[PDB]
Design a protein around this nucleic acid. Structure first.
Ligand SMILES: [Mg+2]
Ligand SMILES: [Mg+2]
Ligand SMILES: [Mg+2]
Ligand SMILES: [Mg+2]
Ligand SMILES: [Mg+2]
Ligand SMILES: [Mg+2]
Ligand SMILES: [Mg+2]
Ligand SMILES: [Mg+2]
Ligand SMILES: [Mg+2]
Ligand SMILES: [Mg+2]
Lengths: 141, 185, 57, 126
RNA sequence: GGUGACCACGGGUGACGGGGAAUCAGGGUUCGAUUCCGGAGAGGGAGCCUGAGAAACGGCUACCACAUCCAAGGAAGGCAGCAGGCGCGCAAAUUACCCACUCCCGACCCGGGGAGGUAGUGACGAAAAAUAACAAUACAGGACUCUUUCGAGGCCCUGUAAUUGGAAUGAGUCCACUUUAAAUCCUUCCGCGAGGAUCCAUUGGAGGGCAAGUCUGGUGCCAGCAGCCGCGGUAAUUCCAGCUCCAAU
């Protein structure tokens, strides 16, 4: 069982210390790796240049082509696929155009279908897809 | 470095279990029952009461005849009678706990506009109070949700400077009067 | 693989419609009056096996 | 007709050579009061002429029934042009100041160090 | 000789230290570069004068590291003061006005203070709080009373409409005043300023978790949806649309 004694404040502290390098959710957060690995250098979103448009094939049970963008981030020069959300919006984005890419909500998990795509596009040439696909702000020229 | 204030803190709490139904179906009554501005305005009073009840409950853990309990208690109770919730000297604390929202609503100005005839339907009240028609004592009050001190109940009255109360008929009646003098006469 | 031609097939060919106009909807606190009133005090009729606040007849 | 200027908190400041108190102006639907009227109506009040009364502060509050503020009274204009600050004398045409305007000063006075001590060039100035 | 698994020594930090913060049944957990206290550094180090008091950077001495003018001999460079710009960047304000408040230095009541205050920018954030109310109708109803019911008296009601109707007000605009330093802003008020077609509330949703339609169009494993569960292959409660509703607002 547990150690339970009265001058055992350390055997306890030091017990509950190491038996966190067996937690998963902290070994992301406190180790290093994460900051080192995620192209998003601990940063909520990030800007990057659209280097080409790529359709991705969804995971078996749901057949469809997902319509994403290969990005290269400015700060790193680290590359990316980001699924351009909402219908017919890939149609908006052209090559070499500067996009603000944010996460998906799973923080590292790829979302649902879109096998291995953490990132979603938000803005395009200082616009925001939400404004374009609503037809509020037009494409700049 | 600068002068200035800070110490800004919220007046409310949002619910956890975000839409129960049961909770919505209570909190709506409250909005209609008394013509409330919005939903938040409940969980203002909801948050304020929960303070009191936790202040009270803080005291119920203390031993009796202990300088704090006696002092903070009276002070706290007085503060409630003062605004007209506990009555007559109910004033012994445990009782505070048995007390619900309805109360710090019933003593909002808005309610005590039609409770004292004055308005004519609950929403008049909230209009009338905003419209700078009613006064308290001498100040003209703009605010619906001013909790009325029990003392200052009898001094809620149609402002001296407003159309009903007297002086300067408002611009609508002034214009449809000047239509009869200028336009017709 | 995959043809990116089909981006925006559907918004593309769905026939658009007018959004109409009637009532500038009442808002703020009057909304909430209209709300309570229309599903608390007013109608509250003989029950017809549960409601359907946005359901059909 | 309806103004009724009632005062609060009068002090005989022997050592600033003054009388000083909170002005409490009542006023009904008619709007604020100007400081000229209030001076002349506070003059016959204590019988000191309007000349020797200085008023600032004045803050009205809802309904327009009432407006508080601070006014005060020296025993001669000679002292008032001494104990009183500039803005309150300059408030009414008795003592004004230069209009060089701050950055003209600064631009000048950061020159005149460049030049040594040849007054002619310091007088050169801007 | 001294220290050591009561963990030293070694390494790391997305570490200036406290005072606190949001979270929170009790216990913690992370954050505290954040105005208050304490420390440090003025590209980096070192050394210096001078000074009570400094190893002082709105001093200087080199060096290193930066960089300006040039008559090519030479010369002047330090925003981690305030403003501003560039670069970096997911990510942050005006070459604004002033010593009037609080305070400080001076030889000093008298100058100066980007210390500081005041404006501007400013969904960092917190408070209050409009976006309509009411009478009569037309009705649409439902507790007394009256009727076997159908009907009616009506104290009760409430739905939509006619807006029938005038009353009330602010958002604006703008005489005037206060404010302040001069404003501004606020508070005060003259004068104008509500019948929607206006003075026009949006963002997500509408299978479930989860409050809200097997309403109606279109597509038909495509487009697309879907944080998870999932839907889409010819009536989709799931896509794109229309109408209705819900949550906060
Ligand atoms: Mg590092
Ligand atoms: Mg630097
Ligand atoms: Mg130093
Ligand atoms: Mg140095
Ligand atoms: Mg400097
Ligand atoms: Mg920001
Ligand atoms: Mg400043
Ligand atoms: Mg806010
Ligand atoms: Mg509006
Ligand atoms: Mg759902």
């Amino acid at each position: 069982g547990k150690c339970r004694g009265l001058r055992t404040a350390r055997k306890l502290r030091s017990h509950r210390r190491d038996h966190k390098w067996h937690d998963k959710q902290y070994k992301k957060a406190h180790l290093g790796t994460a900051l080192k690995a995620n192209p998003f250098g601990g940063a909520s979103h990030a800007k990057g240049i659209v280097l080409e448009k790529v359709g991705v094939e969804a995971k078996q049970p749901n057949s469809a082509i997902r319509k994403c963008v290969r990005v290269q981030l400015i700060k790193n020069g680290k590359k990316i696929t980001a699924f351009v959300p909402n219908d017919g919006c890939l149609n908006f984005i052209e090559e070499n155009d500067e996009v603000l890419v944010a996460g998906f909500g799973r923080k590292g998990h790829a979302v649902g279908d879109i096998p291995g795509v953490r990132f979603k596009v938000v803005k395009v040439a200082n616009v925001s897809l939400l404004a374009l696909y609503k037809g509020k702000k037009e494409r700049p020229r | 470095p600068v002068a200035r204030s800070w110490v800004c803190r919220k007046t409310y709490v949002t619910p956890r279990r975000p839409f129960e139904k049961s909770r919505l179906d209570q909190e709506l009554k409250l909005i209609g029952e008394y013509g409330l501005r919005n939903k938040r305005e409940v969980w203002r009073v909801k948050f304020t009461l929960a303070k009191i009840r936790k202040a009270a409950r803080e005291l119920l853990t203390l031993d009796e005849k202990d300088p704090r309990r006696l002092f903070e208690g009276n002070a706290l109770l007085r503060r409630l009678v003062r605004i007209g919730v506990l009555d007559e000297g109910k004033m012994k604390l445990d009782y505070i706990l048995g007390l619900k929202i309805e109360d710090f609503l019933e003593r909002r100005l808005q309610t005590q506009v039609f409770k004292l005839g004055l308005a004519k339907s609950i929403h008049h009240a909230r209009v009338l109070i905003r419209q700078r028609h009613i006064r308290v004592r001498k100040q003209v009050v703009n605010i619906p949700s001013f909790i009325v001190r029990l003392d200052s109940q009898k001094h809620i009255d149609f402002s001296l400077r407003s159309p009903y109360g007297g002086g300067r008929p408002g611009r609508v009646k002034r214009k449809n009067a000047k239509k009869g003098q200028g336009g017709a006469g | 693989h995959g043809s990116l031609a089909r981006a925006g097939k559907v918004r593309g060919q769905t026939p658009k419609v007018a959004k109409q106009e009637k009532k500038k909807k009442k808002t703020g606190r009057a909304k909430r009056r209209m709300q309570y009133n229309r599903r608390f005090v007013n109608v509250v009729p003989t029950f017809g096996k549960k409601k359907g606040p946005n359901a059909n007849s | 007709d309806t103004v009724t200027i009632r005062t609060r908190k009068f002090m005989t400041n022997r050592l600033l050579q003054r009388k000083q108190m909170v002005i409490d102006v009542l006023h009904p639907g008619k709007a604020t009061v100007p400081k000229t009227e209030i001076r002349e109506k506070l003059a016959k009040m204590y019988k000191t002429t309007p000349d020797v009364i200085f008023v600032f502060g004045f803050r009205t509050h809802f309904g327009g029934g009432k407006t508080t503020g601070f006014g005060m009274i020296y025993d001669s204009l000679d002292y008032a042009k001494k104990n009183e600050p500039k803005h309150r004398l300059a408030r009414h045409g008795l003592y004004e100041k230069k209009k060089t305007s701050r950055k003209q000063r600064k631009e000048r006075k950061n020159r005149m160090k460049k030049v040594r001590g040849t007054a002619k060039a310091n007088v050169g100035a801007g």
